[PDB]
Every structure is written in C-alpha cells, then in structure tokens.
Curated annotation (Swiss-Prot), chain A:
Species of provenance: Homo sapiens (Human)
Location of the protein in the cell: Mitochondrion matrix; Mitochondrion
EC number of this enzyme: 6.1.1.2
Entries under Pfam families matching the protein: tRNA-synt_1b
CDD domains: TrpRS_core
Family annotation (PROSITE patterns): AA_TRNA_LIGASE_I
Protein name stated in the entry: Tryptophan--tRNA ligase, mitochondrial
Annotated phenotype, changing E319K: In NEMMLAS; uncertain significance
Disease: Neurodevelopmental disorder, mitochondrial, with abnormal movements and lactic acidosis, with or without seizures: An autosomal recessive, mitochondrial disorder with a broad phenotypic spectrum ranging from severe neonatal lactic acidosis, encephalomyopathy and early death to an attenuated course with milder manifestations. Clinical features include delayed psychomotor development, intellectual disability, hypotonia, dystonia, ataxia, and spasticity. Severe combined respiratory chain deficiency may be found in severely affected individuals. Parkinsonism-dystonia 3, childhood-onset: An autosomal recessive neurodegenerative disorder with onset in infancy or early childhood. Affected individuals present with progressive movement abnormalities, including parkinsonism with tremor, dystonia, myoclonus ataxia, and hyperkinetic movements such as ballismus. The parkinsonism features may be responsive to treatment with levodopa, although many patients develop levodopa-induced dyskinesia. Some patients may have mild cognitive impairment or psychiatric disturbances.
Function: Catalyzes the attachment of tryptophan to tRNA(Trp) in a two-step reaction: tryptophan is first activated by ATP to form Trp-AMP and then transferred to the acceptor end of tRNA(Trp).
UniProt keyword list: Aminoacyl-tRNA synthetase, ATP-binding, Disease variant, Dystonia, Ligase, Mitochondrion, Nucleotide-binding, Parkinsonism, Primary mitochondrial disease, Protein biosynthesis, Transit peptide
Subcellular location, principal: mitochondrion
Keyword Lyase: no
Curated annotation (Swiss-Prot), chain B:
Name of the featured protein: Tryptophan--tRNA ligase, mitochondrial
Gene3D superfamilies noted in UniProt: HUPs, Tyrosyl-Transfer RNA Synthetase
Substrates-to-products reaction catalysed: tRNA(Trp) + L-tryptophan + ATP = L-tryptophyl-tRNA(Trp) + AMP + diphosphate + H(+)
Phylogenetic lineage: Eukaryota, Metazoa, Chordata, Craniata, Vertebrata
Alphabetized InterPro entries for the sequence: aa-tRNA-synth_I_CS, aa-tRNA-synth_Ic, Rossmann-like_a/b/a_fold, Trp-tRNA-ligase, Trp-tRNA-ligase_bac-type, Trp-tRNA_synthetase
Any single GO CC term annotated in Swiss-Prot or TrEMBL for this entry: nucleoplasm
Annotated EC: 6.1.1.2
Chain sites annotated for binding ATP: Q14, H20, L21, G22, N23, G146, E147, D148, V184, K193, M194, S195, K196, S197
Reported effect, H49Q: In NEMMLAS; uncertain significance
GO MF entries: ATP binding; tryptophan-tRNA ligase activity
Length: 327, 327
C-alpha cells in the first residue's frame, strides 16, 4: 500500500521555506493518498537545547499552524512523535546497522567547524537515523522534504534495503517528494537556506508576520545592483529566489512573472512579491489566530492523532522484534 | 556517597555468549546476594545491547532463553527480584534518546571499550548512553558491574547530574558495586579479562563446562615458573588471578589460601582451584540442564518480569517528558 510520512520540528515559527518546500505538498497529498501521516517531531527538537516551556508552547503553536494551513485530522494523522515509543526502539535497531563515519560525513554535520563538531550533541549527529526510523516505522512509501534532507533520504533508503537484505523484504524503500521550492533562500543571505533557527529575524518570512513586517523584510532583502528583474540563480541569487517565490505563491511561471515585471525595478518588484506572500498567508494567519485560543482542542487533536499512529506503530514494531530475534 | 532515600539495585547482562567465571564472580554472584539485602532489585537481560554486534536471530532468540535459565539456576529469584527483557520496555530507548541529546561525541569516542572494539557502529558507540538510560529509568541507586564498566558508570553519574542540573533533582546519582573479582583474568592471557567474546575456548571457564574441560583449562593456564604459590598481582599476574578465584569460590581469604597451599607446587595448586570451581558450578549446571527443558516457563518468567518493569518505567518516563517539555 502507499503511505506518506513527513515531519517538522516544533521549534521556531513556520516560514516560507517550510511552507513551499514541504507543507504545501502535505496539504495536497492528503487528498491524493489514502494514508497520510504528519508528525511534529519534538524528539528531533532537543538535538539542540530547548527551554521546556518554550518547547511545550511550540508544539501547540505548530499544531495550530498546521491545522490553519489545511491539514485535516479526519484525512491525515497528525501526531506528536514523542508519544509513540516505537520510534526510538526502531531507531536503536537501525543505529546498530550504521557506521559512525556515515553520520560524520553527512553534509549537515560535516560542514560544521571542528569546534562545532566538538560542541554538538550525539543526538544531533544521529538524528538522520531517528528520521529513518520515523519513516520506516509506518512502512512509508513517499516522503515530502526540502533539499537539505535529500542526503538523509538516501540513508533512509539504504537502511530499508539493508534491513531487508538481512531479514527479508519487510520495508518499502521510500521515495522523496520535492517541490520546485526545495530550497527557499534566506532574504539576508541568499547563499543560505531560510531557517526557523536563523537568529536574523529579517531573513525569515514567517507565517504569522504582519503585512508591515513582511514588506519590510522584502525591502531589506539582499539583491544586486542590476535594475532589471531577471531569473538567473547562478548569477543573481537573491533576485532569483524572490522571483521563484513569487511564481510559487501566485501559480504563475517564472517566465510569466518576469514578463509582467518589465519596466519595474527590483526594489519595487520586491514589494510586489511581499504583497503576494501576504495574500497567500493571510487566510492562514486568520485561522491561527482563531485556533490559538482553544488550547484544549489543540491538545486533543495531537492526542487522538498520536493514538492512531501508535496503533500502526505497535504492530510494525512487534513484527520487527520477531525478525530481529527479540521475540 | 549514595544518600537517596529509596534504594534500588539495577544490573544487566547480555544474553549472547556463555556465562563464564568472570561474569559470575564479577557480577552475578553479587546479584543473588543483593536480592536478599535490598527491597528492590532489577535484573535485565539486555538484548538491545547484544545487537551492537550483529546477531543471527535464531541464535539471539535461544540466547535469551538460555540466559534466563542460567540466571534462575544461579539463584535469581523472580519473586524477589524483577527479572526482565530490556527490549520489552520501550522506555529505555526513549530515555536513551534524551540523554544522547545531552552528551557530545568526543566523550563517547574516548571511552576505552569503544576504542578497544574498534582497533564500528553508532549503536556500539552509544551503548553507554543506553546503559545510563537502563539504570536511570528506574531511579536506581546501586549498580553491580565488573571493572570494565567502571568508566561507563562515571558517565552515567555525569548524565544524571547533567539532567538534574537542567531540570531539577530528579535522578539519583548511582553507585557501582564492585567485588574483589571485578576483573577475572583470561586463563591464557592474564593481562586480559575473561570474556564471552573471547575466541579462545581455553581462556574461558564456562558455567556449562565439564569437569574434564575445567581441569584442562587450569592445567593449560598461563603462568610463571616459580614453584611456590604467592599473591603478587604486579609480578605474578596469572598465579594471582587463580589464587583470587580460589579465594572467591571457597569463601576463604587470599591470605588463607596461600598459607594452606604451603608445600604445594603451582601445577597441583591450579588443579585444586579447578576442583573448587567445578564444585561451585555443579549444582548450577545441573539446574541449567533441567530448566532448558521447559521453554514456556522461561518465556513466561520474562514476560511477567517485563510487565512489572514496564509499569515502573512508564511512570518515570512520563515525568521525564513533562520535565523536558514534551508534555
Ligand atoms: N528554506 C527551505 N526551503 C525548503 N524547505 C525547507 C527549508 N527549510 C526547511 N525546509 C524543510 O522543512 C521541513 C522541516 O524542517 P525543520 O523543521 O528542520 O525546519 P527548519 O526551518 O530547517 O528549522 P531548523 O532551522 O530549526 O532546523 C524539512 O522537510 C525541511 O527540508
Ligand atoms: N572478566 C570479568 N571479570 C569480572 N566481571 C566481568 C568480566 N567480564 C564481564 N564482566 C561483567 O559481566 C557483566 C556482563 O557483561 P557482558 O555480558 O558484556 O559479558 P562479557 O564476558 O564482557 O561478554 P562480551 O565479551 O560479549 O562483552 C558486566 O557487569 C561486566 O562488567
Ligand atoms: C534536526 N532533525 C531533523 N531536521 C529535519 O529536517 C528532519 C525533519 C524535521 C524530519 C524528522 N523526521 C522526519 C521524517 C520524514 C521527513 C522529515 C523528517 O529531522
Ligand atoms: C555492549 N553493552 C554492554 N556491555 C556491558 O558490559 C553493559 C552491560 C551488559 C549493561 C547494559 N546495561 C546495564 C545497566 C547496568 C549495569 C550493566 C549494564 O552493556
Ligand atoms: Mn532544519
Ligand atoms: Mn494575488
Ligand atoms: Mn562485555
Ligand atoms: Mn568444597
């Protein structure tokens, strides 16, 4: 059977990259596939230190945001990763199949400075394995992610294959789902992806930002000194990112938005894109504001989702234990 | 040093391999005794730990049953202690993940066990973290182990303290219990500990060994060619190990066995120790043989024990989750 799985960390506020890279896919997917699971991955969150009150609130906030984006709990299973014990159990098993250098040499770790590598947690080092577990546990076939997680998907595939080699065919080898906006760039540093953890508030366009805030971020967005608007990602990273965003939020092609902007300079154009983003977000923000007020419902939503996931997970984990030799 | 009110003993053994003199003198004998000295005692067959070395599932399966027989035979009493299967309690890996988010890679890399085995998997690298979780999960205060695990125990204490520093005093900082026989030496290499994983059958005195086998192993035991029997670990490692075993099995002191052996050559002396070991093991071996006959009973003992552990564990893990911010 086919099944979609994807995850998002509760920490920070959901932004334009998350939305274009993945969340939009999630919403579409729920109507295309019979079985769909979306997880707020709180376990992944703590790979970096979290304040407990902040984390608790982020989970609630993310729940509101996802619902506001269109995730329907009648159609998908929206759940809290920590509430399903099986994730870590499978992760352990998987970790017994992975050599340390495989993890060390993943770009997301490898890129770090020697110091940063000395400072990061073992959880941070190992999250791809947990990620593999999150996916494999439900025998998922399709996984929507951003570009930064592609390498991890290969590991997930290798893990499925490796388990299968040993114990016989058990796990489907999952496939990534990527969008054109797989790597939305930071507004302030177009070399970098847009991130929830970016300390620079200007860089990141959040779902909950005011129109005034969004316009300002686009006003401050780094471009270049060419007046005309063109799409040229190698040449003009910031402008191209902005154009791409525009195309994505409008449903027009890059070629069309560039066409429509003739005679408009970048500076003006950037504010246009901001207006487009504001429109796309606006209904979502209205719903979030409504949802934020009923904590109980948000908690209930996760609880029920978590119960549904647990039923699925328990069954698989028992099968896994038998294959391994535990039972 | 241990000044928490509720005392609890925790210890674990890997199902894989054949229990040997070092396991028995180092740990297992202790366990039996402890079950009478402490009101709460947990002994875990740590199957999760075994798979840090790839296992054949049939072999692992059988190993678990066999370890259960061996422990019962040694005198572990399931109405006095909780004898359980690690894998049946999901909380261990849950806690382990959280702890792994509080430790850095170099700390793990520098551990002697890791360095020794890898001169290697993520699971192997991180077993000490799981070990900490195994202990901490039950708010255990006392941990009987051999010498080879002492370094790991210092990490367990550090992890408890780390968690406590962050979230408030929650975990007791456990203490090792060590015997005189904390490092029983290999009969063929007195510089090395006796190990289940040692390929050289002669080095290892197994619980299931025959009297002829045991006598031969002592006969072949490596030692010096000084005729008299003395205790001198620095200068006479092999002989001293044999003397120490003799004293442990008999209940007599090292100083006493040496005096009684006055007028005895080393060769005859070694065989005398062998006889003493055979006698100690003989009832245990008979019971093992009997217990192996009823697999349903062995399975049921673990099942019952695992259910008891699960209830204890669930309660703690929920508390931990609240502290962390998951709940
Ligand atoms: N700039 C981006 N463009 C497209 N997709 C993205 C972008 N940033 C994150 N994603 C995707 O969003 C999903 C959730 O990732 P995550 O929760 O780590 O968000 P994040 O913005 O990277 O936050 P953090 O900075 O805390 O890691 C993943 O599939 C990830 O690939
Ligand atoms: N030679 C020894 N002397 C005393 N205690 C030992 C000895 N070897 C192991 N132990 C103890 O026995 C317990 C179980 O360890 P374990 O199950 O790993 O046995 P092992 O013989 O080391 O097997 P392996 O070689 O597969 O690791 C631990 O507390 C360990 O410290
Ligand atoms: C720091 N952990 C992490 N970052 C990521 O981008 C992934 C995401 C959040 C993730 C965790 N489990 C998943 C399962 C399927 C798709 C994405 C994820 O994990
Ligand atoms: C390979 N894993 C491992 N080797 C050891 O000696 C320890 C033992 C078996 C262990 C696992 N969990 C424990 C909790 C308390 C005391 C010992 C252990 O772990
Ligand atoms: Mn991320
Ligand atoms: Mn419009
Ligand atoms: Mn060992
Ligand atoms: Mn006797």
């Amino acid at each position: 059977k086919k099944r979609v799985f994807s995850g998002i960390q509760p920490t920070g506020i959901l932004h334009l990259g998350n939305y274009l890279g993945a969340i939009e896919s999630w919403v579409r997917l729920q109507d295309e596939y019979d079985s769909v699971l979306y997880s707020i991955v709180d376990l992944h969150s703590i790979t970096v230190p979290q304040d407990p009150a902040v984390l608790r609130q982020s989970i609630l906030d993310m729940t509101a945001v996802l619902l506001a984006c269109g995730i329907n709990p009648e159609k998908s299973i929206l759940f809290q990763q920590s509430q399903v014990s099986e994730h870590t159990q499978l992760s352990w098993i998987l970790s017994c199949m992975v050599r340390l250098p495989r993890l060390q040499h993943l770009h997301q770790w490898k890129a770090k400075t020697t110091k940063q590598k000395h400072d990061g947690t073992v959880g941070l080092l190992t999250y791809p394995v947990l990620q593999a577990a999150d996916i494999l546990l439900y025998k998922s076939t399709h996984v929507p992610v951003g570009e930064d997680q592609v390498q991890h998907m290969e590991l997930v595939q290798d893990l499925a294959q490796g388990f299968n080699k040993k114990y016989g065919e058990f796990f489907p080898v999952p496939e990534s789902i990527l969008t054109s906006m797989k790597k939305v760039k930071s507004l302030r540093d177009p070399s970098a992806k847009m991130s929830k953890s970016d300390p620079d508030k200007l860089a990141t366009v959040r779902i909950t930002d005011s129109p005034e805030e969004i316009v300002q971020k686009f006003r401050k967005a780094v471009t270049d000194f060419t007046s005309e608007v063109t799409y040229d990602p190698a040449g003009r990273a910031g402008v191209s990112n902005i154009v791409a965003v525009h195309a994505a939020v409008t449903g027009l092609s890059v070629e069309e938005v560039v066409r429509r902007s003739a005679g408009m300079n970048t500076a003006r154009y950037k504010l246009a894109v901001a207006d487009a983003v504001i429109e796309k977000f606006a209904p979502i923000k209205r719903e979030i504001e409504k949802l934020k007020l009923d904590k109980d419902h948000l908690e209930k939503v996760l609880q029920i989702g978590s119960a549904k996931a647990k039923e699925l997970a328990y069954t698989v984990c028992q099968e896994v234990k038998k294959l391994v030799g535990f039972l």
